Every structure is written in structure tokens, then in C-alpha cells.
Scaffold this active site. Structure first.
Site, PDB file in Angstrom:
ATOM      1  N   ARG A 185       0.842  -1.179   0.000  1.00 41.80           N
ATOM      2  CA  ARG A 185       0.000   0.000   0.000  1.00 41.80           C
ATOM      3  C   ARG A 185       0.886   1.241   0.000  1.00 41.80           C
ATOM      4  O   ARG A 185       0.725   2.131  -0.839  1.00 41.80           O
ATOM      5  CB  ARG A 185      -0.928  -0.027   1.217  1.00 41.80           C
ATOM      6  N   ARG A 229      20.563  -6.300   7.838  1.00 41.99           N
ATOM      7  CA  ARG A 229      19.967  -7.611   7.930  1.00 41.99           C
ATOM      8  C   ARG A 229      20.995  -8.701   8.254  1.00 41.99           C
ATOM      9  O   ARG A 229      20.638  -9.778   8.746  1.00 41.99           O
ATOM     10  CB  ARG A 229      19.252  -7.938   6.616  1.00 41.99           C
TER      11      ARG A 229
HETATM   12  C1  LIG Z   1      20.631 -24.514   8.302  1.00 44.34           C
HETATM   13  C2  LIG Z   1      21.306 -23.197   8.066  1.00 44.34           C
HETATM   14  C3  LIG Z   1      21.099 -22.544   6.743  1.00 44.34           C
HETATM   15  C4  LIG Z   1      22.178 -21.674   6.197  1.00 44.34           C
HETATM   16  C5  LIG Z   1      22.447 -20.374   6.876  1.00 44.34           C
HETATM   17  C6  LIG Z   1      23.141 -19.346   6.049  1.00 44.34           C
HETATM   18  S1  LIG Z   1      22.819 -19.441   4.318  1.00 44.34           S
HETATM   19  C7  LIG Z   1      21.816 -18.061   3.840  1.00 44.34           C
HETATM   20  C8  LIG Z   1      20.326 -18.172   3.825  1.00 44.34           C
HETATM   21  N1  LIG Z   1      19.845 -18.787   2.610  1.00 44.34           N
HETATM   22  C9  LIG Z   1      19.750 -18.157   1.327  1.00 44.34           C
HETATM   23  O1  LIG Z   1      20.099 -17.002   1.155  1.00 44.34           O
HETATM   24  C10 LIG Z   1      19.220 -18.958   0.189  1.00 44.34           C
HETATM   25  C11 LIG Z   1      18.790 -18.278  -1.059  1.00 44.34           C
HETATM   26  C12 LIG Z   1      17.845 -17.129  -0.992  1.00 44.34           C
HETATM   27  N2  LIG Z   1      16.589 -17.552  -1.551  1.00 44.34           N
HETATM   28  C13 LIG Z   1      18.428 -15.932  -1.705  1.00 44.34           C
HETATM   29  O2  LIG Z   1      17.868 -15.445  -2.730  1.00 44.34           O
HETATM   30  O3  LIG Z   1      19.500 -15.393  -1.284  1.00 44.34           O
HETATM   31  C14 LIG Z   1      19.685 -16.837   4.024  1.00 44.34           C
HETATM   32  O4  LIG Z   1      18.893 -16.648   4.943  1.00 44.34           O
HETATM   33  N3  LIG Z   1      20.010 -15.795   3.104  1.00 44.34           N
HETATM   34  C15 LIG Z   1      19.461 -14.481   3.189  1.00 44.34           C
HETATM   35  C16 LIG Z   1      20.016 -13.588   2.154  1.00 44.34           C
HETATM   36  O5  LIG Z   1      21.264 -13.461   2.116  1.00 44.34           O
HETATM   37  O6  LIG Z   1      19.256 -13.017   1.325  1.00 44.34           O
END
Ligand SMILES: CCCCCCSC[C@H](NC(=O)CC[C@H]([NH3+])C(=O)O)C(=O)NCC(=O)O
Ligand SMILES: CCCCCCSC[C@H](NC(=O)CC[C@H]([NH3+])C(=O)O)C(=O)NCC(=O)O
Ligand SMILES: CCCCCCSC[C@H](NC(=O)CC[C@H]([NH3+])C(=O)O)C(=O)NCC(=O)O
Ligand SMILES: CCCCCCCCCCCCCCCC(=O)O
Ligand SMILES: CCCCCCCCCCCCCCCC(=O)O
Ligand SMILES: CCCCCCCCCCCCCCCC(=O)O
Ligand SMILES: CCCCCCCCCCCCCCCC(=O)O
Ligand SMILES: CCCCCCCCCCCCCCCC(=O)O
Ligand SMILES: CCCCCCCCCCCCCCCC(=O)O
Ligand SMILES: CCCCCCCCCCCCCCCC(=O)O
Ligand SMILES: CCCCCCCCCCCCCCCC(=O)O
Ligand SMILES: CCCCCCCCCCCCCCCC(=O)O
Ligand code: NI
Lengths: 145, 145, 145
Positions: free
Chosen positions: C31, C104
């Protein structure tokens, strides 16, 4: 009670490790192709890899759900078995997708079969549970007379 | 023990089938509008349909979680009941979204109510479990004297 | 039996509420920046917020899975504990992402540690279950003689 579900719990954990694996591969691709958060777009290598991870991510709760239901209402060992090929297939899925869009299709198919099988088992299991109690009561109402 | 959770397990399975349904609809739309993997963009018909599937995909573990907790700490039948309208609502959600963005709002609202209800049940159930044991011990410490 | 899992069930519910929170924040951002469904693109404020929600959404079943397995095969209280920091960390994650992409990272790291810990507990728990029965049978086959 841990005994009846430890196989299911262990396939569950290997699934978590695998998804975690997929996630780290995505961070690996983000660095390799200058793609920084947000943005999910970039060279098709990166997009193919982001996409693979996402796909497995949404199939992952379907997998867990059916694995548990099949494992509990049909047979734990068989369910865990399907568990493995599924996971193994999703590993081939991710590595294929990463290389080529076309190279992802074979283990996608493999992974679907496995997942369908789980669903069938869950289905059969639930049927055995509910279906006798029901036919019995259908018969009692018509007895009666 | 299968007896206390078979309704929950069965709503769980119908949820899996429904998500699977959503997935096949997306492959159906991908073909219909020349949209091949990766790429999640295209004509708004396709985007509306991809989007519907995704949305249901992220609400799906919320749904399962609360369904199980409500079903176990409050009442299995009622939980399964909410289970159905939720799923039924998400089916209307997906079919509405597919036709129009606006036509998705009514069953979205319907689906939220149902999901909120599950949460309330789970909440109430957890309260009954934890709250007597706590008030008792609050009273013992002040007894004492 | 509700007794052995009520902590796990309650951390589970707080996780659901938190995800729901993330979802309403996204409608709030949609929004605020004129971004209407479909479309997941817009000003980076919006994209950062959509992205935060999505991320937590895919980590959410990993979290639930390991929480349950760790909670049942290792120790319920410790698992629920990790549960909280994880969730608390994901709350800081979302609020950081919303303000800045860089802001973040700290609670992402915090959330990963917590999630890794759960995995370790689950791992250790499964090991204790399976590993004695196995070493015993390895020894019996070689006895034999
Ligand atoms: C069991 C433990 C798992 C692993 C922990 C660290 S890996 C990072 C974790 N995973 C990802 O980023 C995966 C891909 C995510 N979909 C992206 O587009 O970046 C995250 O929260 N990324 C957030 C980000 O960087 O955007
Ligand atoms: C219970 C069995 C489920 C059904 C098995 C086969 S359907 C295909 C399955 N689902 C989807 O593609 C759904 C939509 C997906 N989000 C997309 O964008 O293509 C998949 O893994 N697609 C990968 C892809 O083609 O990108
Ligand atoms: C426990 C109850 C949860 C809350 C119920 C109402 S909040 C709306 C709910 N969540 C979201 O939209 C979250 C973000 C979503 N990813 C988006 O891009 O809009 C939804 O289904 N939105 C669909 C949409 O508007 O696109
Ligand atoms: C039939 C038995 C199947 C065994 C599955 C065990 C998987 C271990 C994964 C770590
Ligand atoms: C008692 C009512 C049970 C209704 C659920 C039927 C399950 C069918 C599963 C396939
Ligand atoms: C458990 C009791 C079985 C009831 C008899 C039902 C007969 C129909 C099912 C075949
Ligand atoms: C109150 C009972 C609710 C029954 C739900 C059973 C759903 C069957 C789905 C297949
Ligand atoms: C013993 C400590 C339990 C703490 C959890 C409280 C649950 C509240 C659920 C609403
Ligand atoms: C189970 C034992 C009940 C303990 C008494 C607690 C009283 C406060 C709750 C109303
Ligand atoms: C160690 C005990 C941990 C307690 C976690 C309870 C969380 C309550 C969330 C509502
Ligand atoms: C009986 C076969 C069990 C195989 C699963 C082994 C679990 C390892 C978990 C880490
Ligand atoms: C439960 C029975 C224990 C079997 C003995 C196995 C010894 C190796 C494990 C340390
Ligand atoms: Ni028991």
C-alpha cells in the site's frame, strides 16, 4: 516412541541438510555473478540456480507432509525409502538445473514419481484406517430392517 | 495412536493434493503463454497464476503447523473442519486469482478467517495446558508466608 | 502426550504468528509504495521488505522440521530455546532488511547459528538412537567366529 519414527525423522533431517546445501549454493552464485540482495534476476546461470533452490523449497513441505503420513499410516520403511530417492532426485534436479534448464527434467520426473508414490502410500494408509469403520456403519444402518 | 490424528492426517493429504493441483496449473499456464523456465514474468494471466500458486505455497506450512497444534491441544474434529474451509477457500483463491486479481479477494478473506480460527484454537489449547500449572506455582510461592 | 511436546508446539505457534506478522508488513508496504498484485518489484524499500518475508518463509519449514526432531530425539527444552533465539533473530532479520540490506546481516548470522544448533542437536539425537543398535550388530556378525 522415538523408535517408530526415527527413520522418518532421519530422512527429514537429510532433507533439511540438502535444502541448506541449496541455499549455500545460491549465496555461492550470488557472489559469482555480482547479484546482491534484493534482486533475483541476473545472468541465466544465476537465475537457473536461484530457481532450482526456490522450486525445491516449495516442494519441501509437500514432501515432509506426505512422508510423515505415509510413514505412519502405511509403512515407515517404505516411506523413508521413497524419501531417499525423492531427495536424491531433488539433488540431481538442482545440479542439472544449475548446468542447463533441460538437464533438470530427468530428475524432476524421478522426483515426481517418488513424491507421487508417497502420496499413494499415504492415500492407501488413510483408506485402511477410515474405510472399514465406514462400511461397517453403512451396513448397520441398513440392517435395520 | 493413528486414531487421534487421522482426520488431521487426512486434511493434510488433501492440502498436499491441492498444492499439487496448483503446481500443474502453473505448468499448464507456462505452456499456454510461451513462458519457459526460469523467468516468472509474462502476460498478467500467467503472472496472476504463478502468483496464486506461490502465495498458497507460503501459507501452506502455516496452515499445517496450526492445524496440527490446534488439532492436538484443542480438538481434532474442529481443527480438521477449519482445515477444510481453509483449503476450500484457497481453492477459490487460486481460481479467482487466475481470472482476476480482484476476484481473489473474497476467498482470500475466507481463507484468512479460517486460518485465524486455527490459530485461536491452538492458542486456547496451549493456554489450557500451560496456564493451570503456572497459576498453581504462582500461588505456592506466595503461600509462604 | 501433549506434555512432552507442548513447548515445541508453543514455539511452533509463535513462529506462525511471526510469519503472519511478516505477511501483514508486506501488505503494509504494498500500500505504502503503490505496488499491487502481481508484481513483486518496486522501490528498493518495498523489494527489501518483500524479500525479507520470502526468505523467512522458506527457512520456516527447515526451522519447524529440525525443531521437532531436535526436540524429540535430543531434548525438548533446549530445542525450544534455540527455537526462540532463531525466531527472535528472524524478527531482527526482517526489521533490519526493511531498513537496510546491510542491517539484515547480523541477525541473519544470529539466526543461522541457532538453526545450525538445532540441526546439531537433531543430528546428535538421531545418532544416539541408531548408533548403539548398529555397533551391537556389527559386533555380533564378527563374533562368529
Ligand atoms: C541450516 C542453516 C542454513 C544456512 C544459513 C546461512 S545461508 C543463507 C540463507 N539462505 C539463502 O540465502 C538462500 C537463497 C535465498 N533464496 C536468496 O535469494 O538469497 C539466508 O537466509 N540468506 C538471506 C540472504 O542473504 O538473502
Ligand atoms: C505431488 C507431485 C507434484 C507434481 C509433479 C510434477 S509438477 C511440476 C513441479 N511444480 C511446478 O513447476 C509448480 C510451479 C513452479 N513454481 C514453476 O514456476 O514452474 C515442478 O517441480 N516444476 C519444476 C519446473 O518445471 O520448473
Ligand atoms: C494467519 C493469517 C495470515 C494473514 C491473513 C491476511 S494477510 C495476506 C496474506 N499474506 C501476504 O500477502 C504476504 C505477502 C505476499 N508474499 C505478497 O507478495 O503479497 C495473503 O494471502 N496475501 C495475498 C495477496 O494479497 O497477494
Ligand atoms: C527401508 C529403510 C530406509 C532407511 C532410510 C534412512 C536414511 C538415512 C539418512 C541420514
Ligand atoms: C469419520 C469421518 C472421516 C472422513 C475422512 C475420510 C478419509 C479419506 C482419505 C482418502
Ligand atoms: C475393525 C472392524 C471391521 C468392521 C467390518 C467392515 C467390513 C468392510 C471392510 C472390507
Ligand atoms: C468434524 C470432522 C471433519 C472431517 C474432515 C475430513 C476431511 C477428508 C479429506 C480427504
Ligand atoms: C514451563 C514454561 C512454558 C512457557 C510457554 C507458555 C505458553 C503460552 C502459549 C500462548
Ligand atoms: C492440574 C492441577 C490444577 C492446579 C490449580 C491451578 C488453579 C488456577 C487455574 C484456574
Ligand atoms: C527451556 C524452556 C523454553 C521455553 C519456550 C517457550 C516459548 C513460548 C512462546 C509463546
Ligand atoms: C536401521 C537403518 C537406519 C539408517 C539411518 C541412520 C541415521 C543417521 C543419522 C545422522
Ligand atoms: C541398547 C543396547 C546396547 C548395545 C551395545 C552397543 C555398544 C556400542 C555403543 C557405544
Ligand atoms: Ni503413545
Amino acid at each position: 516412541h522415538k523408535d517408530e519414527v526415527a527413520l522418518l525423522a532421519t530422512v527429514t533431517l537429510v532433507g533439511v541438510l540438502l535444502q541448506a546445501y541449496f541455499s549455500l549454493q545460491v549465496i555461492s552464485a550470488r557472489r559469482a555473478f555480482h547479484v546482491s540482495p534484493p534482486l533475483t534476476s541476473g545472468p541465466p546461470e544465476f537465475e537457473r540456480v536461484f530457481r532450482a533452490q526456490v522450486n525445491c523449497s516449495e516442494y519441501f513441505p509437500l514432501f515432509l507432509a506426505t512422508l510423515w503420513v505415509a510413514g505412519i499410516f502405511f509403512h515407515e520403511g517404505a516411506a523413508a525409502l521413497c524419501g531417499l530417492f525423492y531427495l536424491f532426485a531433488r539433488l540431481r534436479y538442482f545440479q542439472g538445473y544449475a548446468r542447463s534448464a533441460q538437464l533438470r527434467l530427468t530428475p524432476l520426473y524421478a522426483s515426481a514419481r517418488a513424491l507421487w508414490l508417497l502420496v499413494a502410500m499415504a492415500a492407501l494408509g488413510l483408506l485402511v484406517h477410515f474405510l472399514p469403520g465406514t462400511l461397517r456403519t453403512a451396513l448397520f444402518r441398513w440392517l435395520q430392517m
